[PDB]
Paper text:
Ca2+/calmodulin-dependent protein kinase II (CaMKII) is a Ser/Thr kinase that is particularly important in neuronal signaling and cardiac function. CaMKII has a unique architecture, in which the catalytic domains are linked flexibly to a hub domain, also called the association domain, which forms a dodecameric or tetradecameric assembly. We reported recently that the activation of CaMKII-α by ATP and Ca2+/CaM triggers the exchange of activated subunits between different holoenzyme assemblies. Our data are consistent with the idea that the CaM-binding element induces the hub to transition from a closed-ring form to a ring-opened lock-washer configuration, which can release or capture dimer units.
Choanoflagellates are the closest living relatives of metazoans. The choanoflagellate S. rosetta has one CaMKII gene. On looking at a projection down the hexagonal screw axis, the dimers are arrayed in a circle with almost the same diameter as that formed by the dodecameric forms of human CaMKII. An orthogonal view shows that the helical pitch of the assembly is such that the sixth dimer is displaced vertically by the length of a dimer, with respect to the first one. This positions the seventh dimer directly above the first one. At 48 μM, the tetramer and hexamer populations increase further, and a population of octamers now appears. Despite the striking dissimilarity in quaternary structure, the interface that holds dimers together in all metazoan CaMKII hubs is very closely preserved in the S. rosetta hub, with helix D from one hub domain packed against the β-sheet of the adjacent domain. The principal structural difference between a subunit in a closed-ring hub and one in the spiral S. rosetta hub is a rotation in the outer edge of the β-sheet with respect to the inner edge of the sheet and the α-helices. The interfacial interactions between the vertical dimers of the hub are between residues on the outer edge of the β-sheet in one subunit, and residues presented by helix D in the other. These interfacial interactions are preserved in the S. rosetta hub, but a change in the curvature of the β-sheet results in a change in the orientation of helix D in each subunit.
Residue numbers in the entry:
A (entry chain A), B (entry chain A): 344 to 474
The structure:
Amino acid sequence: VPAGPAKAVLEVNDELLKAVASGDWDAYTTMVDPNVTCFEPEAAGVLAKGLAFHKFFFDNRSPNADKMKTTLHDPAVQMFGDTAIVTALRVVQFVADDGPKTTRYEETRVWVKDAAFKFGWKLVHFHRSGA
Amino acid sequence: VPAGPAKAVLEVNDELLKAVASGDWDAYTTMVDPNVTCFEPEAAGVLAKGLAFHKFFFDNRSPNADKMKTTLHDPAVQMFGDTAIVTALRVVQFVADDGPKTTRYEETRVWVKDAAFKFGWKLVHFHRSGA
C-alpha cells in the first residue's frame, strides 16, 4: 500500500534518522537538499548551511556515537502546498562520563516536494534544540 | 517603494515582533494563523497549537515584560513557492533578580502566502530555542 503525502514525508523523515544513526552519508544525500540550512546544537549558535557542514560529522564520527539510541516521539506533519512541516520530539540515549543519560530535543523539519529526489521529498531546513 | 516577496516577509516578521513587544493582540491576529503551531520555551517542551495559547501570555503580561528590549539579528529568508522560511537570532535584554541580563535565541519562522491576510502572509509555525 502506497503512502499519501503526509504519511510519505513522515516515512522519509524516519528514514533520514536511520541514515544519520548509521553514518550512511550516501543515504543522507538522497534526502537532504544541497543548500539545506539548520539550527542545531552542533552549529554553535548560528545558522549552518550546506551539506559539507554535515559531512564533517559523518567523516569524523566519534567517540561513542555507536552506543547511542535515538527515537522520534509525537511526530506530526502539516502540509502547505508543496511544503511539509514535520515536528517531533527526539529522545537520545547516550553514555557520558557519569554513566548512561537521556536527552530530549524539539525538532522542526521542513520538507519540500521534489520529484527529482529519490523519495519525492527534500529536506531544506531544520531546527533542533535541547531541553 | 514596494517590497518584493523576501523583503516583504522580513518586514512582516519584524512587525510581528513589534506587536508582541507592545502586547498588541489585535495586530498579532492580523499576522498569525489561527492554527499556528510552535516550539518555544513557554510551551513546556511540547508543540503548542492555536492562538488561545498565545493570547494567555498577552492577557497575563507580567511582571517586567515592559523593561524588556528585543532585537532580531542576522535575519535571512529562503523561499519555496508560497512558503518563506525566516531564520534569525533573537537577543533579549531583561532584568532578573541578579540584575540586567541578555539572552540569545535561535528562531525559525515559517510564513505562508495568503492574500486574505492583512500583509499577504501568515505565520503557520515557529521554533524558538534558548542558548
